[PDB]
C-alpha cells in the first residue's frame, strides 16, 4: 500500500529544511525516498532526509504513532497543515466530487433550519477545513436537518482525495454533517 501521511504540524529548522508531523495513514516512509506534497497548493516533490517514529523508529515510519519527516529544501511557507505527503503519483488533488452525506439533526448537535442551494459550509478532510459550494439533486430545493442527500461539491482549494474518502461538514467549528466521496470529478 502506497505511503500517505496527512500533515498536522510543521516545524522549520534553519538551513536543512522543515519537519512535518502527522500520523501515517498507510504504507511506509523511509529516509531517502522521494515524496509528493499534495493538496491546497500546486503539487511539489521532495526527498526525506530524516524520519522519526515517536518512541519506535529512526529513518523509517509506519502507521501507528506520530511520525516526523524532515524534507530538504522545503521552507515553512511552502508547506501547510492539510496537505498530505505521498508516494509520488499515487494520489491527486481535486476540487469537485459527488458525495453521499448525512446531515445531523438539531438534537444531534447539528443545524436547526434546512439549507438551500447557496449553502457554503466547510468540508473537513483529514486535518483541515476547506470551504465548498454544493449542487442539490434535481427537484430538491432544501435539505432538512436529519436527511441523507447526494450532492455535488466544489471546493475552493484542492484536496488530495480518492473515492471512499470520508469527511465532516462544519459550520462555525461545529459538525453539521458527515460524508463520503462517491466519485471524484475534477
Amino acid at each position: 500500500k502506497p505511503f500517505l501521511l496527512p500533515i498536522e504540524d510543521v516545524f522549520s529548522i534553519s538551513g536543512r529544511g522543515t519537519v512535518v508531523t502527522g500520523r501515517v495513514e498507510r504504507g511506509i516512509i523511509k529516509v531517502g525516498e522521494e515524496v509528493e506534497i499534495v493538496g491546497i497548493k500546486e503539487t511539489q516533490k521532495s526527498t526525506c532526509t530524516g524520519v522519526e517514529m515517536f518512541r519506535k523508529l529512526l529513518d523509517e515510519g509506519r502507521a501507528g504513532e506520530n511520525v516526523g519527516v524532515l524534507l530538504r529544501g522545503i521552507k515553512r511557507e511552502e508547506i501547510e497543515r492539510g496537505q498530505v505527503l505521498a508516494k509520488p503519483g499515487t494520489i491527486k488533488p481535486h476540487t469537485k466530487f459527488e458525495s453521499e452525506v448525512y446531515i445531523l439533526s438539531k438534537d444531534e448537535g447539528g443545524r436547526h433550519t434546512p439549507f438551500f442551494k447557496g449553502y457554503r459550509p466547510q468540508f473537513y478532510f483529514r486535518t483541515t477545513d476547506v470551504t465548498g459550494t454544493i449542487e442539490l439533486p434535481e427537484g430538491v430545493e432544501m435539505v432538512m436537518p436529519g436527511d441523507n442527500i447526494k450532492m455535488v461539491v466544489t471546493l475552493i482549494h484542492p484536496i488530495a482525495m480518492d473515492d471512499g474518502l470520508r469527511f465532516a461538514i462544519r459550520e462555525g467549528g461545529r459538525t453539521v454533517g458527515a460524508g463520503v466521496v462517491a466519485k471524484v470529478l475534477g
Binding site: G82, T128, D129, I156, H157
Partner: protein, 107 residues
C-alpha cells in the same frame, strides 16, 4: 488561577484562522495576477470593469490591513500600497504599465 487551558484553546483557534486567511490570500493573489494579465491585454475602455474588480479587491485587502490588522506577505503589502489610489489618472498609468508586460504592481 491557571490560564493555560483557555490559552491553548485560543492558540488552536489562532492556528486555524491564520491557516484559513493565508489560503484566502493565495486566491486573492492568483485572481489579481489574472486581472492584471487581462487588463494588459485589452484596450483602455474595455479595461474599466476589470479595474473595478481589481480595485475592489485591493479595497478589501486594505480593510484587512487597517480594520482587522492582519499583516500579509510583502507582495500583498506592496500591492495594497501601489493600487490604493483609484481614479482615471492612476488607471491610465497602470494600464500602460500592464500593457508593456508588468505582471504585478511596483514602482
Amino acid at each position: 488561577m491557571d490560564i493555560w487551558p483557555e490559552f491553548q484553546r485560543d492558540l488552536e483557534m489562532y492556528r486555524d484562522v491564520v491557516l484559513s486567511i493565508k489560503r484566502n490570500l493565495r486566491l486573492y493573489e492568483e485572481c489579481i495576477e489574472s486581472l492584471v494579465h487581462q487588463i494588459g491585454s485589452t484596450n483602455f475602455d474595455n479595461a474599466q470593469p476589470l479595474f473595478d474588480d481589481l480595485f475592489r479587491m485591493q479595497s478589501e485587502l486594505a480593510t484587512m490591513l487597517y480594520k482587522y490588522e492582519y499583516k500579509p506577505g510583502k507582495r500583498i503589502q506592496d500591492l495594497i500600497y501601489h493600487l490604493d489610489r483609484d481614479d482615471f489618472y492612476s488607471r491610465k498609468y497602470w494600464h500602460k504599465k500592464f500593457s508593456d508586460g508588468l505582471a504585478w504592481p511596483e514602482a
